[PDB]
């Protein structure tokens, strides 16, 4: 095989959440904002080379809901078995003091697709600069997700990617500090 383009959507009850996105060899090409009803590209540049009638994804999602109701009912309302995420914190590139770098929090293999992620710098929440992706499909039908925190390496600092998910017994904090 050489390439795979995946159109992935889902609807979740009772959170009544939904998603519609395209994917190229693992990487998101774009996803539709269910609220603003508009295509948001993974990389600003793509929006200049192609387009997508965002408004249309909402229709699939409507059918998706209806379908979930049906399945829910014929499975005798068999609820979803929660699967806790594997969490990893890595740097965008090799770290070197005061040399700007980005922390990536890899949230993988989990379900349902509802999670709470928080960045901690010395036991305290960081906001500015952070960014996150929507839910990414997996061959096993679980999800992936990435959260980003750009920072300035230092000896003194210790960060945490605090993750919350029903499959977890308690919040998970993946510790990360400069050790090079």
């Amino acid at each position: 095989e050489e390439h795979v383009i995946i159109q992935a959507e889902f609807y979740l009850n009772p959170d009544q959440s939904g998603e519609f996105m395209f994917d190229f060899d693992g990487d998101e090409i774009f996803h539709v904002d269910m609220a603003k009803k508009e295509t948001v590209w993974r990389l600003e540049e793509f929006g200049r080379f192609a387009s997508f009638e965002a408004q249309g994804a909402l229709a699939n999602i409507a059918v998706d809901k209806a379908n979930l109701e049906i399945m829910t009912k014929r499975s005798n309302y068999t609820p979803i078995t929660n699967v806790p995420p594997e969490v990893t914190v890595l740097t965008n590139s090799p770290v070197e003091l005061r040399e700007p770098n980005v922390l990536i929090c890899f949230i993988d293999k989990f379900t349902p697709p509802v999670v709470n992620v928080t960045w901690l710098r010395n036991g305290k929440p960081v906001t500015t600069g952070v960014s996150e992706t929507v839910f990414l499909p997996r061959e096993d039908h679980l999800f992936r997700k990435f959260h980003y925190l750009p920072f300035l390496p230092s000896t003194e600092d210790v960060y945490d990617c605090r993750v919350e998910h029903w499959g977890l017994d308690e919040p998970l904090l993946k510790h990360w500090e400069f050790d090079a």
């Binding site: 959170d15 009544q16 959440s17 939904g18 269910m34 609220a35 009803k37 408004q55 909402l58 229709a59 999602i61 409507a62 059918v63 809901k65 209806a66 109701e69």
Partner: protein, 232 residues
């Protein structure tokens, strides 16, 4: 602080709209969803609420979905007995339910004690301005103490369509136009009464502005509609 009055550059121009103006008119000419004392019965996304309201008129729907600005706004009224007023659309109206359906935005007001003991209606002053001069002034009427700006907007426009051709099948007599609301506390805001430039009018995108479910006090609020002809 309140929202700054618009400058000319801030206003859509009817001349920069190549599409059919009738699509705008459709939304305000004797066109609205109105229901009394009802409660949501479902939702598509967590920021919207679906109701069982019937198109008494032509029987074109019996399910209405209104989208709100966020989930908190949705939750606040999710279980309350409310009243509904707003301008609905069909093109790109989507949702599942559990007859025809129809969509809308905001237009939700609590029902308890928000009325007048007699069927009495409250009048709201609406002064129209054409090229900066007041041409005509009138009043719209509402049965709510606290009313959504949307209900008043719809009513003002409905009138101005019949008595001043605010809109016609293709194009409008006016180049730009905006409706302004003045609250008894000094707070003001306005809606661009003209379609965005281009050859197509996105009814859902336009109506989405009623998102905030913005409500005002009917006994004290004041409306001003500022219109302008192209050359003068």
């Amino acid at each position: 602080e309140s929202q700054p009055d618009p400058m000319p550059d801030d206003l859509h121009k009817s001349s920069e709209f190549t599409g059919t103006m009738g699509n705008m008119k459709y939304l305000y000419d004797d066109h609205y969803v109105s229901a009394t004392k009802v409660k949501s019965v479902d939702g598509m996304f967590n920021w919207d609420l679906i109701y069982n309201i019937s198109d008494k008129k032509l029987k074109n729907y019996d399910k209405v979905k209104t989208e709100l600005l966020n989930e908190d706004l949705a939750k606040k009224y999710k279980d309350e007995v409310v009243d509904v007023y707003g301008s609905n659309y069909y093109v790109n109206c989507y949702f599942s339910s559990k007859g025809g359906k129809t969509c809308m935005y905001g237009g939700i007001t609590k029902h308890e004690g928000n009325h007048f003991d007699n069927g009495n209606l409250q009048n709201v002053l609406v002064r129209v301005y054409e090229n900066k001069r007041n041409t005509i002034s009138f009043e719209v009427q509402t049965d709510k103490k606290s009313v959504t700006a949307q209900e008043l907007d719809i009513k003002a426009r409905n009138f101005l369509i019949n008595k001043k051709n605010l809109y016609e099948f293709n194009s409008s007599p006016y180049e730009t136009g905006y409706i302004k609301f003045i609250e008894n506390n000094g707070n003001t805001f306005w809606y661009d009464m003209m379609p965005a430039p281009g050859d197509k009018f996105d009814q859902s995108k336009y109506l989405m502005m009623y998102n905030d479910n913005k409500t005002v006090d009917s006994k004290s609020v004041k409306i001003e509609v500022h219109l302008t002809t192209k050359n003068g």
